[PDB]
Design a protein around this ligand. Structure first.
Ligand SMILES: CN1C(=O)N[C@H](Cc2c[nH]c3c(Cl)cccc23)C1=O
Ligand code: NA
Length: 247
């Protein structure tokens, strides 16, 4: 259903529930409430869960589960190493989360390392901290991970393939431990370049990355959306690969 909370329950912004504990909060009616109920259905181990909603007078808030190590780029850039089997696992979990989301008919629209949260055991959950998947709540950025068909075309409707492109770039970032396109002159020219086929510099992946993940990332950022696999297709390939060579 969906849990209406009050602000007296507490002591993006961290928030401290008096009975439930640590939560995160994005501070922003039948319609907002209804949207929130729809989002409340997204329940999966790899998906940041909507725990509650605060609808009061001078403030509207969405309340989500806390993830202890922050976003994925933060963890990737940490002074402490992140092993290959663990990166493979993170990829597998991202794939599971995305498949579940598309399975509920939800297209993310803004998947990127910031929207990939990480717990203390380096397990991940997909988030939507910018509310890209929302309609009513978003009303009240970097394009490194945005499919070319959306670049310079804000009216085209985003599909599951859009999220697959973002996923491709995320694979790249996972192996390079940084943002792509550091050599770019300016955003305009960069946008035209990516629209015409430019992609993250694979040579800028210095540490070891299996050739088939390089293959996967190249498949997933194909210019033609229909040449990209779905997330279940990706899983179909990647899971037995992960187990058999990585786990
Ligand atoms: C914005 N907030 C989240 O980060 N997780 C919950 C649930 C949620 C709504 N849309 C989501 C997408 Cl697109 C991905 C993961 C969770 C969600 C939420 O409402
Ligand atoms: Na730029």
């Amino acid at each position: 259903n969906v849990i209406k909370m009050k602000s007296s329950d507490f002591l993006v912004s961290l928030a401290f529930h008096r009975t439930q504990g640590l939560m995160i909060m994005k501070t922003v009616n039948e319609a907002l409430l209804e949207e929130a109920k729809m989002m409340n259905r997204l329940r999966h181990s790899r998906v940041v869960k909507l725990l509650g909603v605060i609808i009061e007078e001078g403030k509207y808030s969405l309340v989500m589960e806390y993830m202890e190590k922050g976003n994925l780029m933060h963890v990737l850039k940490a002074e402490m190493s992140t092993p290959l089997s663990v990166k493979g696992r993170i990829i597998l979990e991202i794939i599971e989360g995305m498949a579940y989301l598309h399975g509920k008919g939800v297209i993310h629209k803004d998947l990127k390392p910031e929207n990939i949260l990480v717990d203390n055991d380096f397990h991940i959950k997909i988030a939507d901290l910018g509310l890209a998947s929302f309609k009513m709540w978003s009303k009240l950025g970097t394009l490194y991970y945005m499919a070319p068909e959306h670049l310079n075309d804000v009216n085209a409707k985003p599909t599951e393939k859009s999220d697959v492109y973002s996923f491709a770039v995320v694979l790249w970032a996972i192996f390079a431990n940084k943002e792509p396109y550091e050599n770019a002159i300016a955003e305009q020219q960069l946008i035209m370049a990516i629209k015409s086929g430019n992609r993250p510099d694979v040579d800028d992946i210095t540490e070891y990355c299996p050739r088939e993940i390089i293959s996967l990332m190249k498949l997933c950022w194909e210019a033609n959306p229909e040449a990209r696999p779905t997330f279940p297709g990706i899983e179909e390939k990647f899971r037995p690969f992960y187990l058999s060579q990585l786990e």
